[PDB]
Write a protein that binds this ligand. Structure first.
Ligand SMILES: *CC(=O)N1CCN(c2nc(NC)nc(N[C@@H](CCO)c3ccccc3Cl)n2)C[C@H]1C(=O)NCCC(N)=O
Ligand SMILES: *CC(=O)N1CCN(c2nc(NC)nc(N[C@@H](CCO)c3ccccc3Cl)n2)C[C@H]1C(=O)NCCC(N)=O
Lengths: 301, 301
């Protein structure tokens, strides 16, 4: 019983966090086997933030310009290279704490855990979702760059996010672990701003199933809807279209609760049109969209 | 920027989780130095749940009736003893991953991280608060007993909670690590139920300061209030009394934002009396009370 924003246990990722310093710039890196990954803007000088040519900046560096510290131990850099917007620092020691891992890029609407770090030291763990506009609503302060996002499945860490910047609205942008940005953001000074966002409909429906599994039933009704008629309502309320694949993915939660997916859609339509009339679902007075169907199944009975 | 329900990194606690089996009952234990701690109801037989005499149940046991597994390694039990509602199983191996730790009992209104576990294997981490009625609104399934709650300060884990049961409303009850229950709950079959709860006023005020630090200002006003006049409003809305100590504890957040505590109280009074008129604070449409002043300071700029 209960339903919380739950992250994956962070220990396997804690043992990978290091501090990378270049000049007077310090941020976090990720140490896997004998490579340390970090945002390439660690080599950016405050003099040309407008259009850094990173190829130029990096050719002017040697290995000894990179200070890597794992706890109280300094790691000798023996190679450096750029991959898209990430730097790869080869070190002379393989991390003995390297978990089984993968680099996976996630979709908008999928969730992951973030281990926020400062000066290579982990400070907290929380759950986040990739928004439809490829930002994340994180919690990060200055120096958090290089903190990572990840999911864990049977002892294997799938890294999906490395933090690079805060946008003007206070939301966050970064890359996958191959250095490729999520969304149109760039690691150079621009008035870049998050494009218009939408609500993740399949996740709101998953969360309504969580609520029914946990005994919140007040929002149910005897009605059904067609997919097409529901999607006309979704569009009006800035919700993403619900696809037949989404309906199929919600199949197990449907079967467990005995509520057809299009019957739940009729409830969501009524909540969008009427509001909640001062009631709450799973302790929230708004419709929550940062739990996937997988998240609900993992957490709920 | 941003404000999330953030837990402490869980690695130091993951390395302490083990599985304890007695008969056909399995739950989690906590392995620190050469002792494993777990709920004593692991020795309860389904035949007398009504008034188990645990002293009797334990005298009838030997060391070999306790199976302790740390990962894939079985730990030899060499001593067993009861302390209040916890069992202490002495094993022949000190946990090499034991962190610096303390056993601390927390107050209602204080927060902590929970590492939910099943069969000695960690599954997720989340943040929780001790409610004024000494329950916690956790997320736990069958077999979660023995999962712990904790805070971390400069490499030292202060354990404050061990999970023992779900109450009929779906909230959770357990003990400190000395085996003493939080609240009036008992590890025997009763219609025990959570007593009436209240909202943690000092934490709501801390969270309004977080919102101002993060640029949500719409709820501020030019008014002030006296402490006595605010507390008359608090009582009406089932909020805890605000003490002068609470006002003092909010001093740093007051100073950083330039908003006097009693000025923020005037805003909270207006939010209680008027509602939010369809607006949100820090992504919530209700007043959040599970962030302490310390939590806000740790997370915010
Ligand atoms: C992750 C982290 O700890 N960061 C983000 C990067 N960094 C920073 N500082 C400043 N000060 C002027 N400016 C930037 N500008 C961004 C572009 C935004 O358009 C930039 C510019 C050049 C190269 C790379 C980048 Cl990301 N970046 C310090 C620090 C931080 O959190 N800064 C807050 C603002 C931000 N845009 O991240
Ligand atoms: C933590 C955990 O994994 N638990 C909780 C304890 N346990 C359980 N099962 C059952 N089945 C009938 N009953 C109880 N009763 C509680 C008292 C509630 O009044 C009890 C009775 C005797 C001794 C100790 C206790 Cl806690 N407990 C299984 C399992 C679980 O989560 N059960 C759900 C219900 C509950 N009360 O925890």
């Amino acid at each position: 019983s209960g339903f919380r924003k739950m992250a994956f246990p962070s220990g396997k990722v804690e043992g990978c966090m290091v501090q990378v310093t270049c000049g007077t710039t310090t941020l976090n890196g990720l140490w896997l086997d004998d490579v340390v990954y970090c945002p390439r803007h660690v080599i950016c000088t405050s003099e040309d933030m407008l259009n850094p040519n990173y190829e130029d900046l990096l050719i002017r560096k040697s290995n000894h310009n990179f200070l890597v510290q794992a706890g109280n131990v300094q790691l000798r850099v023996i190679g450096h290279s750029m991959q898209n917007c990430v730097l790869k620092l080869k070190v002379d020691t393989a991390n003995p704490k390297t978990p089984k891992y993968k680099f996976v890029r996630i979709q908008p609407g999928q969730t992951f855990s973030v281990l926020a770090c400062y000066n290579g030291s982990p400070s907290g763990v929380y759950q986040c979702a990739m928004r439809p506009n490829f930002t994340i609503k994180g919690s990060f302060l200055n120096g958090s760059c290089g903190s990572v996002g990840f999911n864990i499945d049977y002892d294997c860490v799938s890294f999906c996010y490395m933090h690079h910047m805060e946008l003007p609205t206070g939301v966050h942008a970064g890359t996958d672990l191959e250095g490729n940005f999520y969304g149109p953001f760039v690691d150079r000074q621009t008035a870049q701003a998050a494009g218009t966002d939408t609500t993740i409909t399949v996740n709101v429906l998953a969360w309504l199933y969580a609520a029914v599994i946990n005994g919140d039933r007040w929002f149910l009704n005897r009605f059904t809807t067609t997919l097409n008629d529901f999607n006309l309502v979704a569009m009006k309320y800035n919700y993403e279209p619900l696809t037949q694949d989404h309906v199929d993915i919600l199949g197990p939660l449907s079967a467990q609760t005995g509520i057809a997916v299009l019957d739940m859609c009729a409830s969501l339509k009524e909540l969008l049109q009427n509001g909640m009339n001062g009631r709450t679902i799973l302790g929230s007075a708004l419709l929550e969209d940062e739990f996937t169907p997988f998240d609900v199944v993992r957490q709920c009975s």
